[PDB]
Amino acid sequence: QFNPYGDNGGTILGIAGEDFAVLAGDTRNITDYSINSRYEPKVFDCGDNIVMSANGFAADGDALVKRFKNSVKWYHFDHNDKKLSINSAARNIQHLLYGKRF
Amino acid sequence: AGYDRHITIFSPEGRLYQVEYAFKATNQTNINSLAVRGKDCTVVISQKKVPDKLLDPTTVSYIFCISRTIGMVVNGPIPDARNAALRAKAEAAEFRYKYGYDMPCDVLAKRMANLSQIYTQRAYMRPLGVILTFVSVDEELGPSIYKTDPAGYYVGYKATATGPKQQEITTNLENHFKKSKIDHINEESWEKVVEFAITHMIDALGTEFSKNDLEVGVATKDKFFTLSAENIEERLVAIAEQD
Amino acid sequence: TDRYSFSLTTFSPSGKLGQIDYALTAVKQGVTSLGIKATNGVVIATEKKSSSPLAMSETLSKVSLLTPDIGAVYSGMGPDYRVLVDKSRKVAHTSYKRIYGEYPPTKLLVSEVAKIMQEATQSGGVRPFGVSLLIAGHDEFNGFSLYQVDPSGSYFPWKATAIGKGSVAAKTFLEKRWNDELELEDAIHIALLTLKESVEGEFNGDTIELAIIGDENPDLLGYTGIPTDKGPRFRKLTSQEINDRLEAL
Amino acid sequence: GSRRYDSRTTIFSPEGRLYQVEYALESISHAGTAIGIMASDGIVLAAERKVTSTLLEQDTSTEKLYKLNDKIAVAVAGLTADAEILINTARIHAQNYLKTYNEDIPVEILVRRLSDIKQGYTQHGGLRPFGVSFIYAGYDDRYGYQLYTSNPSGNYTGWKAISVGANTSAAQTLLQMDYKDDMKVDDAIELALKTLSKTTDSSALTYDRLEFATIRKGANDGEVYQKIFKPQEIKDILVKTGIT
Amino acid sequence: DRGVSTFSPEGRLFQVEYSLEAIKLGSTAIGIATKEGVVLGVEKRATSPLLESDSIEKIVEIDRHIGCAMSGLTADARSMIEHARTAAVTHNLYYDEDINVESLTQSVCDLALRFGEEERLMSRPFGVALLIAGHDADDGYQLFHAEPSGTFYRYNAKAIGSGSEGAQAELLNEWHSSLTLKEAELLVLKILKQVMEEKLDENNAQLSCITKQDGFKIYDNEKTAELIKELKEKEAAE
Amino acid sequence: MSVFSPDGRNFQVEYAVKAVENGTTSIGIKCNDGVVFAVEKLITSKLLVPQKNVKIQVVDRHIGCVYSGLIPDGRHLVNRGREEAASFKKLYKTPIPIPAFADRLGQYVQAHTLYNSVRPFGVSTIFGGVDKNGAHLYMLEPSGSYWGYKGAATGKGRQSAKAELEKLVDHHPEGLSAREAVKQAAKIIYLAHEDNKEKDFELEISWCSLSETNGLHKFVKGDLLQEAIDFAQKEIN
Amino acid sequence: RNNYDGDTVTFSPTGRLFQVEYALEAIKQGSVTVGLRSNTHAVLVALKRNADELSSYQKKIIKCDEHMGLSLAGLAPDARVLSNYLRQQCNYSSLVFNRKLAVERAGHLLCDKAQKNTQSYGGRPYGVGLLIIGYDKSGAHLLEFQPSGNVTELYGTAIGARSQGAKTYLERTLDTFIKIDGNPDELIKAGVEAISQSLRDESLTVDNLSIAIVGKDTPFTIYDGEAVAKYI
Amino acid sequence: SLGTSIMAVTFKDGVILGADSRTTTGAYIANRVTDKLTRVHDKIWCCRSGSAADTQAIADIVQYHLELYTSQYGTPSTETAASVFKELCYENKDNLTAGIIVAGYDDKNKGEVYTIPLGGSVHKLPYAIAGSGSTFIYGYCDKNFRENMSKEETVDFIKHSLSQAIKWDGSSGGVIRMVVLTAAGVERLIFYPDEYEQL
Amino acid sequence: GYDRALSIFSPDGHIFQVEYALEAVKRGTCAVGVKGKNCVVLGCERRSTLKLQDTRITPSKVSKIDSHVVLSFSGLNADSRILIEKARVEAQSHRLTLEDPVTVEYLTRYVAGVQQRYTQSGGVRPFGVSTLIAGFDPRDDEPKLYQTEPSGIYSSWSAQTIGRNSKTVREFLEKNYDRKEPPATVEECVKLTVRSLLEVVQTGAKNIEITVVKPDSDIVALSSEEINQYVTQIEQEKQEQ
C-alpha cells in the first residue's frame, strides 16, 4: 500500500531567555541511511519576529510553514497590519494542525 | 401587447408565435433544397450562393455528413444548422455505441424532432430556425428521406423540397410521380438520379446553374458522400445533352 | 440554465386557467378523431391527413400502441402527442410492469398519462400540452374501456366520443347510433360512418388510420410455447382491410 | 430578462389577500356541488357530476368521491387532475402513519398534513395553488365521525354539515334549516339528496348525474364500513326518497 | 418591475438608496467618542404606553470590548448582531486575542452587500444602520457607522435616524478634542432630548458606554435617571 | 435574446452587431503558407505606453485571434478558445485543427443566442492558423455564423478594407507570400483608418506561417514591423 | 431606455449595455485619484472624501501584494471584492509558482472577472474604477481598470470627478515625470501636483491626502497624515 | 481475460497485426476461436490482452470516440487513436487490466504501431509483442525483425514468432489470425494448427 | 430554483409585502392578552357561532407550544399553523440540548426570527400573522406576554391586542389597565379581558373564548358558561351607571 508519510529526521531546539529566544535545528535531511542534503534549512523567520520549524516529515513540515507564513500575510491584510503576537501565532498554528486532525 | 409572442406559450388562438417565427428563419438563407429517391440511393440538392469573393467558397456548405450512412441538409441560418448537425452526429454515434447498429434515418429524425418539440414547451429555450432533411439508404427500409421542422413535426418522404420556393419545386415533383406512377426515380446509376434532380430544379426555378451554384449529397448502401464542383460539372455537362 | 421556475399557467380573476383554455382551442383545430366501445372490443380512429402527396402517411402513427392491450389516438399538436406516447409507454413499464410483472390496466395508465399532463399545467417554465387523447384498452379485471384525456390533466371514460373539428357534429351522430348491444364489427362500421363526415378530401384506407382493441392475436405474438401468453388485443387495421370494409357500407 | 413572465403567484394584495388563492376559489365555485352531512351513527357524502352526456360512462367511474383509507374519504370540487395529485400523497401519508405507529391515522392529522401542503403553494415556490376544495369524511376512535373541509388557501375547518363548489350559498341555508344533532344516517342521506335536488342547474336529479358515499357501522359489531354507492344503488335510493 | 441589484443612471443602487430611506424613519441613536470611552444612547419610542418599555433593546453587546446601537428596521439587525458576535468570538478562538473594532465592523459591512439573485442568498439589503463602538489596544476608543451600502466611516461623534442632521449639526458644534466621559454622557442625553418627540426620561431613552476598564455596560434605568436630573440642573444655571 | 422577432431574426444579436460596427477595424489575410492578422489601436491619450496594450491573442501555439467590438467579450471567447484547444489536444494528441477550432467557437457563441437570460457576444472575431493540411482564415459574428476566408475584416473601416482585399484576391490569384501579406495588411489598416481618423492610431500585426514562423504564431516586431509601417506611409503620402 | 436598461444581459438598439454605462457614472462621481510612474517607481496619489468634519476620510488605497497595490473611486465594497480577488491571484502565483504576479497579468484577470458580470443575469457590473501600480520583472507599471472590463496600461492617468484636469496636466508633464527615475520624493510631488489640477473647491491637506509608491528597491507602501505633511 | 499472444509489425507497405485465438479461464479454454483483432476504425485496429471485459469495453468506447471524431474532424491518425486508448487506460489504471497494441495505416505515415502496457503509458514502435506468450519470443522477434519488410516476409515473421509463443505458452493457442493494413484496403488472414506447428 | 425577491424596498423606504401582510392581520379575528399579578389571560373573537359548524375538533385559536407557554394569533390561519409547528419543535430541541424548557422571551425571539427571515429571503412572502405569546419561564412566577409582527419585530406587553378592531380595544385597555394595579386575581384579570373584547364582539359568550395560564405549566380553557358568568355580570354592572 502507498504510505503517505516518511521521516527526514533532524533535531530542533527551542530556548527562551529573559529578553531573547533561540530556535536551532541541525542542517541534515535524510531517508533511512542515506543523506539528502548536508544543508537544507529547517528553521524559518516568518515575519513579526516569529521563527519556526516543523520537524519530522519535511514535506508536511514545508506545507505547514508555507501555510503559517501565509496566515501572517493575511493577518496583515485582514487586520490592518497588526503585528501577530507570539501567543496569537501559537493559537493560529493549533487551528492549522487540527484542521488535518484525521 | 405581446408576451405570448416572445416565449413558447399559447396565444388565445392556440398558437406559439415563436415557432412560427422559427419557420420564417428557415428561409433567411434564400436557398432551396430537394431530395429524391433512386432505385437504391438518395440524392439531395441545395443551392449554393457565395456572393462575396473573400469567402473561401469550399467552406460554405449547408449539407452535413452526420453518420457514415446518414447525410443531412439544412434550410436555415448556419449557426443553428451547425448546432443541429453536431447534435445529430453525437446522437448517431451514441446510438451506435449503446445499441450495436447504425442509427437509421427515420429514428434520428424522430430523435431530433423530439428535441425541437422540447423547445416548443420550455420557455427559456427557443426553437432552432431550421428544417432538417435527413437521407440514407436504410438497411431495413431502403432509400429514406425524413425531414423535421421547428414544431417538432417529422415525416417520411417519397421526395421533398424546402426553402422560399418549397411550393414550386414540390408541385414539379408531384407531377412527375403522377406520370411515372411511382415513388422513386427508376434509375440504376446514382449519377442519373442526380441529373434528374438538378434537371427538375432548373425547370421549377426557371434558373440555370454553374458548378458553384449547387451542392449535391448522395446516399448509397453503406456511404453518404458529397460531390465536388468537378463531379457536378460532369452531371451538368451531361444534363446539357438531355433535351 | 432554466430560470423559468415559476408556473406559466395561472388562475385568472374569473377563475380560468388561460393556457389550458388555449390548449383546448388548439385541440378544436386538430383533425377529428374518435373512439367507440362495443361488447367485444373498442375501436379508435382518425384521419391521416398529409398536406403533400409526396409525404408518406404510412410513416405516421396517429394511432399508437402503448401496451399490447392498450392503444391511443389524438387531436391537436402531433409532436406533443408523439412525446406522450414515449412517456406513456415508459411509465407503463417503469411504474407498473417492472414491479408487478403485468402491464398496467387501462384506467391506471390513463392516470399516469394524465399525471404527466397535469404537471405541465403547474410546473414552472412550461405550457401544457396542446392535445386531447382518446385511449382504448382492455384489462383482465375491467373488460374493455375508453378514456379521454385533456390538457388540464382531467380525464373521463366514455361509451363513445369524438374530439377535434367534428367533435360537436360527430358526438351527435354517435348518440344516435350507440347501443349496449353493439358487437365490435358494428362499432367499426359506425366509426367509418361518423368519420366520413369530418374528412373532406379523399376518404379511403390511406387517408384513414384505424385501430382496435379486441380478441387476442396468437398469430401476432411472435413466439409459441407459453399457453398462458395469448397475443395482443390491439390490432391496427391495414388500409387493405379498411377499404374492403368500406366497399360494404 | 426571464422575470417579465413571473406572474408572482405567492404575493399579497394591497388589502392582504392572496390573489391566486381567491382566484382559485372563483374556479371552484363553478364546480359540481358536493355535500357532507354527519349523523350520530354515520356520515354521508354526495356529489353532482358537473357535465354529462348520454354517452359518458358511469358504472366504471369515480370523478368526485375518492377513498383515502378504510376509515377516510373525500369529495372533490375543482380540477380533478389537481385533486388526484393531492389524493395520492394523502393515501401515502395515511400509510406512513400506519406503518410507523401501527394505528390508522387520526382524521385531523391527515387533514392538517394535506392542508399544510396546499398552504405551501401559497407562501413559496412561485407556483399556482391547487384548484381544489375537499370535503373529508372520516372516523377514528378519538373523535369518532368527523367532517372537514379544506380550500386552496390551505385552511381547514370542521363541520356537522357542509357544501363546496357551486351554489353553496343556497345549500348552506337548507342544511341549516333541516339539519339537527340527533340526526340518523338515513335522515342525512335523505337530506343530502333533497338539498342537491334544489341546487342542481339540471332540470332533474337522476342517478347518472350523481355520486354518493356513506361511512357508518352497517351492523357489524364495533366495525366501520365505507360504501361508494354503485349506479344501481343510487337509483334504488332515489326511488325511496320520492324522486323516481 | 426591474431587478434588485439594478443601477440607476446616477450610478446608485436603487435598493441601497431606498434602504437608507427606511433608516431616516428609524428611532434616533447617537454615539460620542472620547479618550475616556465611547458613549451610545438611543430613543426607545414605545408605540403605546402598555408596551413594557425595557424589552426595547436597541443597544446590544457584541463582545466585552464592543457595543452597538441601531436605527430603522431593527428586525433586520438580528442577523447582523449574530454574525458580529460570531465573528468576534471566532476571532478570539483563532488568535487568543480581541478582534480590532475596525476588523469587526468591516466583517459586518461585507455581510451588507451580499444580496440579490460569493453565494449571496438574501433578497434585499438590510434596512437598518449601526453605530459600532468599542476599544482595541491599537487604535484606542472608536465609533463606526455601518450602512446597508457596505460602507462604514469612523466618527468622533454621530447620529442616525429621525433626528440625525439636527443632531449631527448640534454634534459638530458641541464635540471637542478633550471631553470627559461624563460630558459625553450628557451631550447624548441633551441632544436626544432635543430631537426626540417625547420628553426624554429614563423609560424612553437608554444610555451605555464602553471603557477599556470595564468594557461595555448598559446603564440601568436608575443611573441614567440621575444623569437626566444632572442635565436639568446643569441647564437651569444659565 | 433567444426570441425571434416576427421576421425570423434575433434582435439582440442584431444589436450586438451594432456594438461590433462601433469597433476599431481588424483584419485577416490568408497567404500561401499561413495567415496574417492586423488591428488598429486608437491612441486615446499620449499616456498609453506604446506597444503595451496588445490586443492580438494567441491560442495554443499555432492560432491567432483578433477582434473588434467589446474587447472583454473577445477575451472571454479566446479564454473558452484556449480551454477548448487544450481539451481537444489532451485527448486527441494533435494540436487542434483550425476548422475544428472554428466550430468550437461557433457552437459556443451560438449557444449564447439560445437563452433569454444570457446575452450574445459583442465581438466579431477573426482568427486562423496552420494545421495538418494547409492554412485557414476564419471570421465569426455574434450570430455564431462563421466561414473560411481569403481575406476578412470587421469594424468601422470594414469596407475600406474589404475593398482593398477584393483587389488583392483579384489582382493576385497565384497566392501572396507571408511577407507581402504583412505589408499589404499594414497598408489596409492605414487606409481603413480614414473612417475613424479623429484620433491617432497604433498598428499591430501578427502572423502564422509555415516557412517564416515554422507553423507557430508570432508577432511581427522590430524591423519587419518598420518595413510594414514604412510601406503603408508611402501610399497615404 | 425603459426596457433595455432594466438589466445587464441586454443590448440597446444602438449596441450598448446601459447598466455598464450607469456603473461608470458612480466612478465619475467618485473622489479623484491619480496614477503616474517613471522607470524606477510608480505612484498613487489619492484625494479622500469625508461625510462630516466629525467623519474620517475613506481610504482610496489598497495593497495587493508586496510589489503591487491599487487606488479606487466609485463603490468601496466593489474595490474590496476586486482587491481581495487580486490579493489571491498574486498569492496563488507566489504560493504555487514561487513567482511574483506580473502587473500586466493582473489587468487581464480583473478584466475577465468584470466581464462575466456584464454577460451573466442576476449579477450587476462592478461599480468601481481602479488604478494599479507595481514593479514586476519588467519594471514599473500603471493600469487603468474599468467595470466594463477595459484595463489599459499607461505612464499616468486619473479617474474620479474632476479627474479631467489632472489627466490633461499629465498629458503635458509627460516627458518630465517619465524620467523621475531614481528619485522617489520627486515623483510623489509630481503626482501631488497633478492631483491639484482637478482640485477646485477645497485644497489638499494631511487628512485629505493619501499616497502610495512602489519601485525598484521600494516595496509598495502607503502613507497617510503626518507622513504626507512633507509634500503639502 | 485474454492472457494472450499478440503482435503488430510495421513493414514496407503498412502494417500487420497478428494474434492467437485462445482465451482461458483457469485451465479450461473458454473460447478457442477468439478474434483478438478488434477494429476501432477502417484502418486502425488493436489487439487485446488482459481482462476481456475491460479490453472490449475499452475498444468499444474508443471506436465510439473515433466514430464521432470521424464525423466532425474527418479521419483520425493512428496516433490520435493510440492517444484515446491511453487516456482511458491511464486515467483508470486502478480498475483496468488491459495491455493493448494499436496498429493503423495513414497514407502519409504508412504503418504505425503503439503499445499500451499496464501503466497506461504509450510507446511508438516498429513492432510490438504482448500477452502471456510474448515473454518467449522476445529473443526470436528481436533477432528476426527487420525494418521495411515485404508483406510476404512480415506474414512469415508473424507466423513464426506466434507459432513459437503458442508452442510454449499454454495460455495461448488455436489458429493464428492476422489483419493486413495497406493502401489497398484491409486483408484478413488465418493459419490453422496443421500449418504453423510444422515450422 | 425560485428565488425571486418578493419582499423589496420602494422609493419611500417601505417593503409593501410586509405591510400588505399586516393588512391581512388587521383582517383577522381579534386577539388579546393581559397579565395579572400572578397570571396571564388570552382572549379571542370568533366570527359568529355558527349554527352548522363543529367546534370540538376544528382549530381553536390558542395553541400550546410547551406545557408552560402558549401562542395566540390574528391573521391567516393557514400561515399560523406553520409558525406553531416550528415553534413546537424549537421548544423540544431546546429541552434536548439545554435541559430546560424555553423562556417565553426565547421562544418569542425564535418565532419573530422566522417571521423576519421570510421578509428577507427570496421565493417567499412574509407571514400574514401577528402573535401574542404568553406563559411563565420555568421555576419562575413573574408573568410574561410578548407580541410578534410579520416584520419580525417583537416586544413585551402588560396588555395587548391585535387583529380586527384591535385599535378600539387597545384604546380601551390604555384606559382600563394600571401598571401599578395589575389585576391581582385570576378573576379580576379574566374580567378586564372579557370586557376589552365586549366593545368589538357584538354578542356575549358565543364568540369569546378565554385561556388562563398560571405558573408551572398550569393552563385551562374556560368553557362557555364560566365565560357567560362574566358576560352576565358585565352587562348589569355597566347598567347601574
Swiss-Prot record, chain D:
Q: Which Pfam families match?
A: Proteasome, Proteasome_A_N
Where in or outside the cell it occurs: the entry states: Cytoplasm; Nucleus
A Gene Ontology biological process in which this protein takes part is: proteasome core complex assembly
Main localization is cytoplasm
**What are the UniProt keywords, alphabetically?**
Cytoplasm, Isopeptide bond, Nucleus, Proteasome, Ubl conjugation
Coiled coil ranges? none
Ubl conjugation listed as a keyword: yes
* GO cellular component terms, A-Z: cytosol; nucleus; proteasome complex; proteasome core complex, alpha-subunit complex; proteasome storage granule
Covalent cross-link site, Glycyl lysine isopeptide (Lys-Gly) (interchain with G-Cter in ubiquitin): K99, K198, K230
Kindly give any further remark recorded in the entry.
Answer: Present with 17100 molecules/cell in log phase SD medium.
So what does this one do?
The proteasome degrades poly-ubiquitinated proteins in the cytoplasm and in the nucleus. It is essential for the regulated turnover of proteins and for the removal of misfolded proteins. The proteasome is a multicatalytic proteinase complex that is characterized by its ability to cleave peptides with Arg, Phe, Tyr, Leu, and Glu adjacent to the leaving group at neutral or slightly basic pH. It has an ATP-dependent proteolytic activity.
NCBIfam families named among the record's database cross-references: PRK03996.1
Family membership:
Belongs to the peptidase T1A family.
Q: How does it assemble?
A: The 26S proteasome consists of a 20S proteasome core and two 19S regulatory subunits. The 20S proteasome core is composed of 28 subunits that are arranged in four stacked rings, resulting in a barrel-shaped structure. The two end rings are each formed by seven alpha subunits, and the two central rings are each formed by seven beta subunits. The catalytic chamber with the active sites is on the inside of the barrel.
Swiss-Prot record, chain E:
Q: Name one GO biological process term.
A: proteasome-mediated ubiquitin-dependent protein catabolic process
Q: Which domain of life is it from?
A: Eukaryota
Instruction: State if Nucleus is listed as a keyword.
Output: yes
- Chief location of this protein within or outside the cell: cytoplasm
Which is one Gene Ontology cellular component term of this protein? proteasome complex
Q: Where are residues bearing Phosphothreonine located in the sequence? A: T47
Q: Which residues carry this modification: Phosphoserine?
A: S48
* Alphabetic keyword roster: Cytoplasm, Nucleus, Phosphoprotein, Proteasome
Q: Which InterPro entries match?
A: Ntn_hydrolases_N, Proteasome_alpha, Proteasome_alpha-type, Proteasome_alpha_type_5, Proteasome_asu_N, Proteasome_sua/b
- State whether it acts alone or in a complex, and with which partners, per the record: The 26S proteasome consists of a 20S proteasome core and two 19S regulatory subunits. The 20S proteasome core is composed of 28 subunits that are arranged in four stacked rings, resulting in a barrel-shaped structure. The two end rings are each formed by seven alpha subunits, and the two central rings are each formed by seven beta subunits. The catalytic chamber with the active sites is on the inside of the barrel.
What is this protein's function per UniProt?
Answer: The proteasome degrades poly-ubiquitinated proteins in the cytoplasm and in the nucleus. It is essential for the regulated turnover of proteins and for the removal of misfolded proteins. The proteasome is a multicatalytic proteinase complex that is characterized by its ability to cleave peptides with Arg, Phe, Tyr, Leu, and Glu adjacent to the leaving group at neutral or slightly basic pH. It has an ATP-dependent proteolytic activity.
Q: Which family does it belong to?
A: Belongs to the peptidase T1A family.
PANTHER family, alphabetically?
PROTEASOME SUBUNIT ALPHA/BETA (PTHR11599)
Designated name of the protein: Proteasome subunit alpha type-5
Swiss-Prot record, chain H:
InterPro entries of this UniProt entry? Ntn_hydrolases_N (IPR029055), Pept_T1A_subB (IPR000243), Proteasome_bsu_CS (IPR016050), Proteasome_sua/b (IPR001353), Proteasome_suB-type (IPR023333)
* Alphabetical list of CDD domains matching this protein: proteasome_beta_type_6 (cd03762)
State a single Gene Ontology molecular function: threonine-type endopeptidase activity
EC id:
3.4.25.1
Active-site residues from the entry:
T4 (nucleophile)
The top EC class is hydrolase
Name the Pfam families on file: Proteasome
Which residues lie in coiled coils? none
Q: Where does this protein reside within or beyond the cell? A: Cytoplasm; Nucleus
Which GO terms of type biological process are on file?
Answer: proteasomal ubiquitin-independent protein catabolic process; proteasome-mediated ubiquitin-dependent protein catabolic process
Q: Which reaction does it catalyse?
A: Cleavage of peptide bonds with very broad specificity
Can you cite an annotated GO cellular component?
proteasome storage granule
User: Which UniProt keywords are given for this protein, alphabetically ordered?
Assistant: Acetylation, Cytoplasm, Hydrolase, Nucleus, Protease, Proteasome, Threonine protease, Zymogen
**PANTHER family named among the record's database cross-references:** ATP-DEPENDENT PROTEASE SUBUNIT HSLV (PTHR32194:SF0), METALLOPROTEASE TLDD (PTHR32194)
The entry sums up its family as follows: Belongs to the peptidase T1B family.
Which miscellaneous remark does the UniProt record hold? The side chain of Thr-4 acts as a nucleophile, and the N-terminal amino group acts as a proton acceptor. Present with 7250 molecules/cell in log phase SD medium.
Name of this chain's protein: Proteasome subunit beta type-1
Instruction: Give the organism the record lists.
Output: Saccharomyces cerevisiae (strain ATCC 204508 / S288c) (Baker's yeast)
- Gene assigned in the entry: PRE3
Swiss-Prot record, chain I:
Task: Name the domain of life.
Answer: Eukaryota
A single GO cellular-component term on record: proteasome storage granule
Recorded hits in SMART domains, A to Z, give: Proteasome_A_N
SUPFAM superfamilies, A to Z: N-terminal nucleophile aminohydrolases (Ntn hydrolases) (SSF56235)
Q: Name one GO biological process term.
A: proteasome-mediated ubiquitin-dependent protein catabolic process
Q: Name one Pfam family in it.
A: Proteasome
Where in the cell is the protein located? Cytoplasm; Nucleus
Functional note: The proteasome degrades poly-ubiquitinated proteins in the cytoplasm and in the nucleus. It is essential for the regulated turnover of proteins and for the removal of misfolded proteins. The proteasome is a multicatalytic proteinase complex that is characterized by its ability to cleave peptides with Arg, Phe, Tyr, Leu, and Glu adjacent to the leaving group at neutral or slightly basic pH. It has an ATP-dependent proteolytic activity.
Q: State the family named in the UniProt similarity comment for this chain.
A: Belongs to the peptidase T1A family.
Q: Which miscellaneous remark does the UniProt record hold?
A: Present with 16800 molecules/cell in log phase SD medium.
Q: What is this protein called?
A: Proteasome subunit alpha type-4
Q: What is the gene name?
A: PRE6
